[PDB]
Ligand binder design. Structure first.
Ligand SMILES: O=C1N=C2CCCCC2C(=O)N1
Length: 163
């Protein structure tokens, strides 16, 4: 059912994550971690102390899809190294701290199914459009997450307890 999901999302904040390759999103799914450049690191840390839920929604460039969404369970901290595949012109020290995350949905969602959702914080372009880190406004954020196929392998009871 959808009810506990609607509970987790209540008064959440949402952020579009754009990844260059599937390899890093797979690593995020397996280890429960994400890291960003300092510009986004700072904004995620503010949002983490400002809302009961900060949701990251992941998209792999050129995939035509979202790959799932997760909630932050900590602010960023500097631990066990993470063997990210780094783009041309980037090294591991340029990355910021490591955010812990609890996945809420690990299934895909194709852009064709979110083509009625516009993001007011990005000039009302379709929600799929946005730079890495772009905030998605509350109402669009919620409906985007509800569009995902349910992930019956996830139990939001433990997630609810961290709120
Ligand atoms: O915000 C970013 N997060 C990541 C995560 C993994 C390395 C590539 C990467 C990046 O280039 N930018």
């Amino acid at each position: 059912g959808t009810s506990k999901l609607k509970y987790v999302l209540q008064d959440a904040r949402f952020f579009l994550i754009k990844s260059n390759n599937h390899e890093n999103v797979s690593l995020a799914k397996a280890k429960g971690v994400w890291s960003t450049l300092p510009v986004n690191e700072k904004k995620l840390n503010l949002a983490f102390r400002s809302a009961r839920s900060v949701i990251l929604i992941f998209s792999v460039r050129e995939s035509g899809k979202f790959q799932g969404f997760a909630r932050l369970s900590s602010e960023s901290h500097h631990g066990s190294p993470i063997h990210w595949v780094l783009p041309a012109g980037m090294s591991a020290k340029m990355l910021g701290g490591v955010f812990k995350i609890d996945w809420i949905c690990r299934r895909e969602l194709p852009f064709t199914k979110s083509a009625h959702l516009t993001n007011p914080w990005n000039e009302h372009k379709p929600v799929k459009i946005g730079r890495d880190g772009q905030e998605i406004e509350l109402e669009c954020g919620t409906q985007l997450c509800l569009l995902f196929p349910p992930d019956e392998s996830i139990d939001l009871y433990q997630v609810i307890h961290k709120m």
